[PDB]
Design a protein around this ligand. Structure first.
Ligand SMILES: Nc1ncnc2c1ncn2[C@@H]1O[C@H](CSCC[C@H](N)C(=O)O)[C@@H](O)[C@H]1O
Ligand SMILES: Nc1ncnc2c1ncn2[C@@H]1O[C@H](CSCC[C@H](N)C(=O)O)[C@@H](O)[C@H]1O
Ligand SMILES: COc1cc(/C=C/C(=O)O)ccc1O
Ligand SMILES: COc1cc(/C=C/C(=O)O)ccc1O
Ligand SMILES: [Mg+2]
Ligand SMILES: [Mg+2]
Lengths: 218, 218
């Protein structure tokens, strides 16, 4: 998917000087490139950056919303500590069944707990937990319509100092539309405007893939 | 300076949804915008990302190469722990004198140790130190001709797990030139190619400002 709004020629170069995916990440991405939905997955550049954040941050407790075939979860899982844990939320049983196949295949399935079913229902159960779980990092990358909800609910399930990571903030450049007619564009426009003055977090909008925002909880 | 190779219209939006600089950072950047060289400074987006990395990483020992009027050093310094320290290296006494004026003015001059004189001479003294200093993060942003040296020397002065940050890796898009005639372009082209297969680090090329690479030491 390259980089939204980035020069095609400069993106090719950026790729030239970027790191290849490890074996199983590359394999997962390579073997499923044919199946529909593959374009929804984060780019290889985002996966590398994502794994770099798990390491740099020291994260052990991760919460992913929007799993699909497990590519992003796998990227992070490969950098988790021996006691690292990922709670993966996804509504699709078929794509997620493929995710499970590759996680166990890479030996990180032990560090990933898939929660099949609507993400909101799962978040509600997490907040209803005794004691209240608190993740070091949360990756929001599912249905855009519910981003405001996932951010808010996840923000209280995030430790102070934790990092929220949201994908698709530049939404194919549609965010520049004056009167957006598409629902996801409208929801993302308001989401970005709201987050730009959310004084509970210190943010950084990064142009990798379809745009990703890093929100560090104060 | 926007973002090298990024859409001007999308960059304006990205700015719209980005965080403003704190008082003294904005003030420093605002009051010196008239002086020559101001365009060399990292963009506001990079400063925000830079401060976010100091926090997320837990860095206490920082090494900056390429100080100028102190903007980047100030961005990082404002996020340092009470015991945080920055060793700032710069050859220019006049621009650096202005840097000092703003650091003390923001109350972080206590956490910044300016080393005036050729960066190589200063790095040589740091490596000649007893005991050998080891930084958590190193920001290389000076004369491009010496990037290979600053990276190599700094890499051994960096702790394992530490983070190397290099600016200007996309060098005004000149990195795409087939037969670059400019020295900095040639040096940066080789630098990026060498770093892309440097197995001592895990990298990520980020398109913010004039391109910045994050190299996490294994
Ligand atoms: N309401 C909902 N609850 C849970 N999952 C949902 C959902 N709406 C959409 N999803 C999931 O959101 C996912 C977005 S694609 C995720 C891609 C993955 N992060 C990667 O980069 O590899 C889809 O798999 C879809 O099944
Ligand atoms: N050989 C050398 N040794 C030390 N400093 C050098 C040098 N060559 C260039 N420099 C310094 O490299 C700096 C690059 S500009 C630095 C901008 C600063 N990082 C910011 O973003 O605010 C200049 O101030 C120049 O004085
Ligand atoms: C459903 O959520 C997503 C949708 C897309 C769609 C991409 C495209 O249409 O090319 C991409 C990434 C997503 O996370
Ligand atoms: C000397 O090092 C630098 C030079 C420039 C030049 C920018 C321009 O010419 O517009 C920018 C950033 C630098 O770190
Ligand atoms: Mg996405
Ligand atoms: Mg620079």
């Amino acid at each position: 998917k390259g980089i939204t709004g980035f020069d095609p020629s400069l993106y090719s170069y950026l790729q030239s000087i970027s790191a290849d995916d490890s074996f199983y990440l590359a394999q997962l991405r390579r073997e499923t490139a044919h199946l529909p939905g593959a374009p929804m997955q984060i780019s290889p550049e985002q996966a590398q950056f994502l794994g770099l954040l798990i390491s740099l941050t020291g994260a052990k407790q991760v919460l992913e919303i929007g799993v699909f075939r497990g590519y992003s979860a796998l990227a992070m899982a490969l950098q988790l500590p021996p006691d690292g844990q990922i709670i993966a939320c996804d509504q699709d049983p078929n794509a997620t069944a493929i995710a499970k196949k590759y996680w166990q295949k890479a030996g990180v399935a032990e560090k990933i707990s898939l929660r099949l079913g609507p993400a909101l229902a799962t978040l509600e159960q997490l907040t209803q937990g005794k004691p209240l779980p608190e993740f070091d990092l949360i990756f929001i990358d599912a249905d855009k319509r519910n981003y405001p909800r996932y951010y808010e609910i996840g923000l209280n399930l995030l430790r102070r100092g934790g990092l929220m990571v949201i994908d698709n903030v530049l939404w194919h450049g549609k965010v520049t539309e004056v009167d957006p007619q598409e629902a996801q564009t409208q929801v993302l426009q308001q989401f970005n405007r709201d987050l730009a003055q959310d004084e509970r977090v210190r943010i950084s909008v990064i142009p990798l893939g379809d745009g990703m925002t890093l929100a560090l909880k104060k």
